[PDB]
Design an enzyme around this catalytic site. Structure first.
Site, short mmCIF file in Angstrom:
data_model
loop_
_atom_site.label_atom_id
_atom_site.label_comp_id
_atom_site.label_asym_id
_atom_site.label_seq_id
_atom_site.Cartn_x
_atom_site.Cartn_y
_atom_site.Cartn_z
N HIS A 1 0.80 -1.28 -0.22
CA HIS A 1 -0.23 -0.44 -0.30
C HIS A 1 0.77 1.51 0.42
CE1 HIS A 1 0.39 -0.96 4.27
NE2 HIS A 1 0.36 0.82 4.40
N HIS B 1 1.27 3.22 2.31
CA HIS B 1 2.38 4.73 3.46
C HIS B 1 4.14 4.23 3.50
CE1 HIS B 1 -1.47 4.19 5.93
NE2 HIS B 1 -2.15 5.47 5.11
N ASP C 1 6.16 2.94 5.24
CA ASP C 1 6.38 1.56 5.56
C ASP C 1 6.56 0.80 4.24
OD1 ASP C 1 3.39 1.73 6.46
OD2 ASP C 1 3.99 0.77 7.52
N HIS D 1 -6.96 -1.26 6.26
CA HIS D 1 -6.11 -0.45 6.52
C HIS D 1 -5.72 0.54 5.89
CE1 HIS D 1 -2.25 1.41 8.49
NE2 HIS D 1 -1.74 0.80 6.76
N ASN E 1 -2.41 3.19 13.34
CA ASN E 1 -2.64 4.08 12.54
C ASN E 1 -3.33 3.81 11.70
OD1 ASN E 1 -1.57 5.56 10.07
ND2 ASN E 1 -0.13 4.32 8.95
C1 LIG Z 1 1.56 1.43 16.52
C2 LIG Z 1 2.29 1.66 15.03
C3 LIG Z 1 2.79 -0.47 14.63
C4 LIG Z 1 1.14 2.02 14.07
C5 LIG Z 1 1.63 1.69 12.73
S1 LIG Z 1 3.87 2.47 12.39
C6 LIG Z 1 4.00 1.88 11.10
N1 LIG Z 1 4.66 2.66 9.56
N2 LIG Z 1 2.54 1.93 10.32
C7 LIG Z 1 1.32 1.46 11.46
C8 LIG Z 1 0.49 0.38 11.40
O1 LIG Z 1 -0.49 0.69 11.85
O2 LIG Z 1 0.57 -0.60 10.57
ZN LIG Z 2 0.23 1.77 6.31
ZN LIG Z 3 1.49 -0.49 8.65
#
Ligand SMILES: CC(C)Cc1sc(N)nc1C(=O)O
Ligand SMILES: [Zn+2]
Ligand SMILES: [Zn+2]
Length: 231
Positions: A83, A85, A87, A148, A179
């Site tokens: 996706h 984002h 990460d 998500h 998130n």
């Molecule tokens: C509490 C965290 C893992 C929230 C984060 S940070 C991040 N890069 N992704 C998330 C997610 O929810 O997928």
């Molecule tokens: Zn994400």
């Molecule tokens: Zn994530």
């Protein structure tokens, strides 16, 4: 033992062997004042490697390539981001510079552009509608519907019964949402049920963040999501 968030300094990447020819990669990064771990996948693709997701940032993604070269020694030739984002696409420019052909769905590429994030080069066709699946070398890509994020994909490795859920699947120990600014909370349980129906034989289930589990992570994530919506 699967590496934990406190064991991975920001800027370093660990590889974890899941099965013959299947690894997760684990990195760490800061978000809203805290450091979190993040998973992706590596899958042997003949004499090449398929990468699923960046290691959350250019510096981590460079360390990822160096660790692959050191530990596995086959070239990463393709990458899929699951996706839009950071990460997942954070580090695409590094991958491109290193010679990796980067891929995402049209929705992901569009949302990344909107968000000012890095943009995978090539569009993945055949994933526009909830329930669509396509083959991509040694894996199947599956779009389960909004969860998500509206564009999130999951990835299945048939040769090993490995399901990579990305950020639509939560690890067992995670009990709050998080998130979800870009989530579809109402659709997320329905999307998870599509995953269950399509991959009932999954032996290993890798969440986007945290420790691997089994199909129990699917029901677990639905509970967490609902709890957020209830109140
Ligand atoms: C509490 C965290 C893992 C929230 C984060 S940070 C991040 N890069 N992704 C998330 C997610 O929810 O997928
Ligand atoms: Zn994400
Ligand atoms: Zn994530």
């Amino acid at each position: 033992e699967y590496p934990t968030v406190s064991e991975i300094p920001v800027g370093e990447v660990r590889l974890y062997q899941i099965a013959d020819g299947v690894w997760s990669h684990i990195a760490t990064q800061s978000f809203d004042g805290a450091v979190y771990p993040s998973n992706g996948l590596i899958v042997r693709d003949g004499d090449e490697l398929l990468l699923i997701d960046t290691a959350w940032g250019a510096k981590n993604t460079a360390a990822l390539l160096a660790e692959i070269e050191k530990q596995i020694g086959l070239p990463v030739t393709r990458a899929v981001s699951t996706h839009f984002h950071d990460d997942r696409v954070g580090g695409v420019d590094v991958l491109r510079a290193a010679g990796v052909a980067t891929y995402a769905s049209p929705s992901t590429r569009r949302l990344a552009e909107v968000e000012g994030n890095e943009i995978p080069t090539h569009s993945l066709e055949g994933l526009s509608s909830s329930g669509d699946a396509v083959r991509f070398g040694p894996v199947e890509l599956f779009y389960p519907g909004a969860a998500h994020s509206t564009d999130n994909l999951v990835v299945y490795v048939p040769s090993a019964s490995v399901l990579y859920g990305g950020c639509a699947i939560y690890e067992l120990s995670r009990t709050s949402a998080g998130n979800v600014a870009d989530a579809d909370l109402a659709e997320w349980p329905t999307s998870i049920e599509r995953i269950q129906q399509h991959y009932p034989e999954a032996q290993f289930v890798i969440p986007g963040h945290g420790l691997p589990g089994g199909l129990d992570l699917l029901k677990h994530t639905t509970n967490v999501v609902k709890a957020h919506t209830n109140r």
